[PDB]
Every structure is written in C-alpha cells, then in structure tokens.
Amino acid sequence: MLKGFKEFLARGNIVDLAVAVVIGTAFTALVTKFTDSIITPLINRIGVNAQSDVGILRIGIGGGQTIDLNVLLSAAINFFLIAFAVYFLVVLPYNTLRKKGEVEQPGDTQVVLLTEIRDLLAQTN
Amino acid sequence: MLKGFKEFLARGNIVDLAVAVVIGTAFTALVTKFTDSIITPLINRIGVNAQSDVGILRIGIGGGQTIDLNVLLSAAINFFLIAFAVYFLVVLPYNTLRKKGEVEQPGDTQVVLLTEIRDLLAQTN
Amino acid sequence: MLKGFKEFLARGNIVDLAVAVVIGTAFTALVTKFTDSIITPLINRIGVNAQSDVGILRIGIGGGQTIDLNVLLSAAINFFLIAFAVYFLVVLPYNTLRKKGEVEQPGDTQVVLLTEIRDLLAQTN
Amino acid sequence: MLKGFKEFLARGNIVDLAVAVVIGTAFTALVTKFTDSIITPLINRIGVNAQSDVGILRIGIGGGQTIDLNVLLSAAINFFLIAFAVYFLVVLPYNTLRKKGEVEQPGDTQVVLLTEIRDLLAQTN
Amino acid sequence: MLKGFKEFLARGNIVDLAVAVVIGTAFTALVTKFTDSIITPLINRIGVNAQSDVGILRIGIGGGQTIDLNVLLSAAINFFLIAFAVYFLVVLPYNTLRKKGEVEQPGDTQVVLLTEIRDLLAQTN
Ligand SMILES: [Au+]
Ligand SMILES: [Au+]
Ligand SMILES: [Au+]
Prior knowledge:
The structure is a homopentamer. The first copy, chain A, is mainly alpha-helical.
C-alpha cells in the first residue's frame, strides 16, 4: 500500500498537479471569503441596487421578485481582486524571474540539449 | 523551509497549473453569479414552469412536490453564456495566434529542433 | 500590463488548462442542475426511501434522524448520466477519430522525427 | 466560427483535460454525497461528539456555541472512502498496467527512441 | 464500449489528471471542514470581530448590516493549515525524493538520454 501510493507518486506528475489544484482551490476560496465578509457588506449598506418586478408564478407561488445588482458588482469586485492578487503576487515574480532567466522547466532543458545537439551535429560537417 | 517551498515553485509546472485552475474556477463562478442575479429573476418573473405532482414520502414527510424548469433553463442559459464567453474571449485569440503562429510552446520548439536535426543527419549522407 | 498578461498567455499552456477546468466545472454543474430539477423531484414523489432511526445526540440536541436514499440514488443517476454524456458525446468521437487516425499532436510528430533520426543514424552505421 | 470551435477541439489536449476535470468533479461529488446520506446520519445517531461552550459574541449575538466532531469525523470517513476508491478503482489498474506494460504514452515511446539512439550512437563508437 | 473507454484511458494523460483533481479537491475539502468544525467555533466563542453599520437597502429591505471579521480570520487560518498540510505532507517528501533522485519521470529519463547523446555526439569530435 505504501508502495502503491509511493510508486504512483514517483509516477506522480499527478502529485505536481494535485498540489496545484489544491492551492488553486484553497486560494480562490480565500479571495472570495474576503470579498464576502469585507466587501459584500460594504456593497450592502448602500444597496440602491436590487431592483425588481412583480412575481406570482402561476406554476409555483405568488408574491414578488427581485434583481440583485449588488451581488453582481460584489462578484465583479471579487474577480478584480483576484486578478490583482494573482497577477501581482504571482505574475510580477514569475515573469520577472523568467526574463532574468533563473526559473526552470523540463521542456526548456530538453531544448537546450537538443540545441546543443544541433550545434555539435553541425560541427561534425 | 523557504528553500523547499521556493524550489518546489520553480518546479511549478504546478504554478502554471494552480494558476490555471484559479482563473478557471474564478471565472466560471463569475459567469454563474451573473446568470443567477440577472437571468434567473427574468426567467422567474415569467415562471409558468415549475410544474409538479403530489408528494407524501411514506418514509420522510407528506405535503407536495415540484419540478422546476426555470432552474434547468436558467442553468442552461448560464452554460451557453460560458461557452460563448470562453470561446469568444479565449478561443478567437488563442486559435488565431496559433494559426498566425505568435503563441509559443516547449513541445513545438523541441519539434523544430528535432526537425533540424533530421535535416542535418540527412545531409550527412 | 496588457503586454504582461498577454505575454504570459502566449506562454499559456496555462490558457489551455484554465479553459479546460472552466468547461469541466461548468459542464458538471449543468448535469447536476438537470438532475436536481428534473430527476430528484421524480425520485421524491415516490420517495419510499429516506429511512431512519431515533436521534437525540447527548452532545448536541435530541429529536430524530434519517438516512436519505433518494439523494444517494439521485446522485448515482446524476453520475451515470455524466458517464453517458461524456463518453457518448466525447468518447465515441475521439476514440473513432484516433482509430481512423486524424488527430494531430506535438508528441506524435516528435516520435515521427525521433523515428526518422533513428533510421538515418542506423543508415550511417 | 464552426471552423474555430472544431479546430480548437482537434487541438484539445484541452478536451483530454476538460474530460478529466469533468470526471474528477463528478466522481468526488458522488462519494461525498454517499457519505452525507449514508454515513453522516449514522455518525449522528451516536453523536456523543459535538461538544461546546457558551457563546454570546459581544459583536454579533448572544446565546451558546458548538464544536462538531461528527462532521469532522464524517468528512474524515468521506476522505478515506475517496482514497480507497481512487486507489482501488484507479490505482490498482493503472499501476498494474504500467508495470505489465500496456498503458502507452508519447513520452515513453520517445524515451525508447532516445534510448535506441543512445545505443546506436554508442555502437558507432 | 469497454474498448472505447479503456482505449481512451491508456490514452489517459486524462487519468493521471482526473485523479489529480480528485485528490486535490478532496483534500482541500477536508482541511476546510476541520477548520470549520474545530477552528471557527474557537474563533467564535471569542468573536469581538463581526463589526457593522446600519443597513436599510432602499431597493431591497431595511434593518441592519455586518462585516464578519471572524470568518475572514477563520478562512485565513484555514489557508495556512492547507499550506502547512500540503507542504509538509506533500512537499518534504517529493522535494526530498527528487533531490535524492529516488523519484523518476519520463521527462527526466529523456534528459539523461539527451545528455548522453549530447555527450557522445561530442565524442565523435
Ligand atoms: Au400536496
Ligand atoms: Au425521534
Ligand atoms: Au449558551
């Protein structure tokens, strides 16, 4: 069992990925929770949004219906906050490190080797 | 420790992925929120949908039961909006950049290299 | 800024992935919404499921408790429908196109080149 | 337009992926649903868990507060069930197939090719 | 049918990934549940947070509104626990195994081979 989980993990391109979804989900969850506790309430004190129209579904009930705009705006703001947080926390550093050329990846090293291979092959002739 | 987390992050084919799931979930969520606040209500002012039949679960309760179509239809519209949104915002540009050729990738460059190698090895004959 | 987001996207193996999660989550959501509105109610008019046993948690409350089977079954049905939908819509077409041989890919072209190289190298020797 | 969606789909390394997320979310949801309907109720009849302490938030309300264990354990059990399910349904078969050598992959065929090349390049010397 | 799903599965880069999303979502779900059951309550007996301001939406209702801070801190702590959990359970072992090199992967063997090839091509000169 320790062998199946561990042998699958050496195999575990899956491990790199599982972690990625783990962080990705954990983090999106954090930004939206901040938005709900801090932002949505702010949107709400004001709320001259949520308009409406009469709603007596002759199939379900009968009383009144609304169009909540504050929620949409609350969500839009949440979205922007995510883009700023990700781009700023993540993007400035990863893009800066790839430009200064200090980050890595399997495809890139293969390329260097393939390239070196090309050069030597060229030298033989 | 700072070493383990950072070393794992340059490693972060995972980083590319985590970000991808982060945006994918964040965005799908934004579209569904719009569908729910703006669209579901419009579907609802009408609502000649939600039909039903008697429901007295001789196992749970006893009172009445409903089949909501407005929700099914509201959900479907949400989906189309996502398909159009992803395809139009994401698809027209990425597919157009690949056809014109501007977007890049590790596999493609390896190909270029392998190809040149093939051409050279052929030249040696 | 427009340059940074766009340059990271050209970079975006991530874009391929983010899009994938977006569609995958959006679609699963659609299937379950159909199951809940059309199917669960049907399970429920019948609902001779949800059994139970007394439940007075001497730690939290005291009143009664139930085992909802209708939900378990509704979910299962939801699942089978997903399997029929993905396999029938996605699988019949991708397995049939790979069998007839018409789907291109970076890994496959590389193999072709690697193979040509092997053959040529064998010719020199 | 039909050309853009279809050309992106032949392209769909993404399709492979979307299907993966689609299936992954669908299945996990199925297990947790079984956990909730079947398992949680059982945890709950017993429930000598959920302990507590008075809770009158002088900032929000005022009355009493609880620490639920049955849920923590219910989730824990849900989790073990997922691991056994994924590992047993998924892991025994893919690890056995990779070991017996039947599940193929572009990366692996390339390896064989690279390996063969190494061997040949070596015979020349 | 058994052939199409199975043929698609050997094909299944998708299988590696789907399993990855399954484990990532399942695990994040577990961390947050622990936080909610064990942690949020602890945060709450205390709760001198959830501040507020009057809230009578001249568009929706009219009565009062709150900015729940406890939830924000509760979510943050949840996040740390995930970071600690993934890195400590996942990171120490994978980072250590790669350093000891005990861990294997198709990309890495490709590199070794590319290197040897580079080295041999270099010897011919
Ligand atoms: Au009734
Ligand atoms: Au009872
Ligand atoms: Au109390």
